[PDB]
Write an enzyme that holds these catalytic residues in place. Structure first.
Site, PDB file in Angstrom:
ATOM      1  N   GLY A 224      39.287  44.124  40.907  1.00 34.29           N
ATOM      2  CA  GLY A 224      38.238  43.366  41.571  1.00 34.29           C
ATOM      3  C   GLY A 224      38.677  41.932  41.820  1.00 34.29           C
ATOM      4  N   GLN A 225      38.270  41.038  40.924  1.00 35.22           N
ATOM      5  CA  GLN A 225      38.644  39.633  41.008  1.00 35.22           C
ATOM      6  C   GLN A 225      39.668  39.451  39.888  1.00 35.22           C
ATOM      7  OE1 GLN A 225      39.348  37.032  42.476  1.00 35.22           O
ATOM      8  NE2 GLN A 225      37.432  35.883  42.754  1.00 35.22           N
ATOM      9  N   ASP A 226      40.938  39.709  40.199  1.00 36.03           N
ATOM     10  CA  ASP A 226      42.005  39.596  39.210  1.00 36.03           C
ATOM     11  C   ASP A 226      42.185  38.185  38.664  1.00 36.03           C
ATOM     12  OD1 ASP A 226      43.929  38.323  41.202  1.00 36.03           O
ATOM     13  OD2 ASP A 226      43.746  40.324  42.101  1.00 36.03           O
TER      14      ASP A 226
END
Ligand SMILES: Nc1nc2c(ncn2[C@@H]2O[C@H](COP(=O)(O)OP(=O)(O)O)[C@@H](O)[C@H]2O)c(=O)[nH]1
Ligand SMILES: [Mg+2]
Length: 181
Positions: free
Chosen positions: A70-72
């Site tokens: 997702g939002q690494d």
């Protein structure tokens, strides 16, 4: 269905605690599988705003499920669940070629975590029902599973929506989790 899958785990009754993580990019089919095997209530929690985790527990077994890729920059947040993991299930959308490389990276990055170094690896090449879905073979290539060494892994074709391949996948997993340690 849930009955026969539930049986498979009777194999690990001696184990004090079987920890199973089930990950994959969003929309790969994780949630579907959880409600399809009906092994227990799909308790949902929100550790921190925006991070959704699904937990299923029955007897000495527990599943912890969340979306990766997702939002690494939230990746460290996932570490709270690595310690003492016995098995890792990576669910992939076989029909999604645009994000298969993201799956690959998340997977190889995740199985090389010091804490997941000895976890059995079960890969579900889901959505095999779709016409233009990559075959398990092509998903194996795209995920570069053949580059995994010293690890016990297996790729299983599935159609989470119908349930095909789930029993097989879990039959393999529980068989190996049993004679692991
Ligand atoms: N065609 C098809 N769709 C599927 C399959 N498994 C799951 N889906 C669908 O794909 C989406 C994935 O949702 P889930 O809620 O399964 O996603 P995830 O938890 O983020 O992996 C949903 O729209 C499901 O109905 C499958 O085997 N075939
Ligand atoms: Mg989900």
């Amino acid at each position: 269905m849930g009955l026969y899958v539930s049986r498979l785990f009777n194999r690990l009754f001696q184990k004090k605690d079987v920890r199973i993580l089930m990950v994959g990019l969003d929309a790969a089919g994780k949630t579907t599988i959880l409600y399809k095997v009906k092994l227990g209530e799909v308790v949902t929690t929100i550790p921190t705003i925006g991070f959704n985790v699904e937990t299923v527990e029955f007897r000495n077994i527990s599943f912890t499920v969340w979306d990766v890729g997702g939002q690494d920059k939230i990746r460290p947040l996932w570490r709270h669940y690595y310690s003492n993991t016995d098995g890792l299930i990576f669910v992939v959308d076989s029909n999604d070629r645009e994000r298969i490389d993201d799956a690959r990276e998340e997977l190889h990055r995740m199985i090389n975590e010091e804490e997941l170094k000895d976890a059995i690896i079960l890969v579900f090449a889901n959505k095999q029902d779709l016409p233009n879905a990559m075959s398990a073979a092509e998903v194996t290539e795209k995920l570069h599973l053949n580059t995994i060494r010293e690890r016990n892994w297996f790729i299983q074709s599935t159609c989470a929506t119908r349930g095909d391949g789930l029993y097989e996948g879990f039959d393999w997993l529980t068989t190996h989790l049993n004679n692991a340690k």
